[model samples]
Target: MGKDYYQTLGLARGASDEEIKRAYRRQALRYHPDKNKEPGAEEKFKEIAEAYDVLSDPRKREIFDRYGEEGLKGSGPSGGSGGGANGTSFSYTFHGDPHAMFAEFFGGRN
Candidate 1:
């Protein structure tokens, strides 16, 4: 089954780009490894990161919205600015370091 990226980030399917960005920031910070320290906080943080990685991009978001998680199989990391018209040609896996992804977003603010 496909995971609902919007629901994963506590958003509606039609959420705006800004909403996606805001939701990511909020969720990532809340579940950050340094703050939550719970057994699953890190995992949750990674989930949020993965969700944001897909939703933040127009193409990936469309594929996700249309095909669900199955469409994103083999999709690469959410390096939004790269890739050609077809988007990145690789599969994605969270770097297993939520903090680094968080730092990439917040510009080391965290």
Candidate 2:
């Protein structure tokens, strides 16, 4: 329902935050462009990054739960006047690099 972050991770709604980390790590590795060679891997990894990027952040998830995807499109750091979608607009662009986030996991991943 409405770009649900949980759906992207194949999770039930209101899943535990630890589950969120588990799902992202388990699948992001499989879907990561560096590891997977399928044609769909590119987009799949991209979506995975976006999903984890938002869901991993406590406040971002709250905003996403309340406003859906667009609310997240341009949220954070405040810049580049791209709003007017609906109530309370900010700015958030996915770093768009699944690889970068993959590295983030390395620091703590067992």
TM-score for candidate 2, residues paired by index: 0.64
Q: What value of lDDT does candidate 2 attain over all alpha carbons?
A: 0.64
What lDDT tens digits, residue by residue, belong to model 2 across residues 1-110? 35556777778877887888777777776765456778766666676677877776666667667667766675422323336444555434556454465577653243
Tell me which residue pairs clash in candidate 2. 74-90, 74-91, 74-92, 75-91, 75-92
What are the lDDT scores of the predictions, listed in order?
0.64, 0.64
Superposed Cα deviation of residue 64, candidate 1 (Å): 1.5
Q: Write the per-residue lDDT of candidate 1 for residues 1-110, one digit (tens) a residue.
A: 44667787888988888887777777877876555788766666676777887666565667666656645654335344223425555444465344464577784343
Q: What CA RMSD would candidate 2 show? A: 5.7
Minimum summed lDDT over a 10-residue window in model 2 is located at: 75-84
RMSD of 1: 7.3
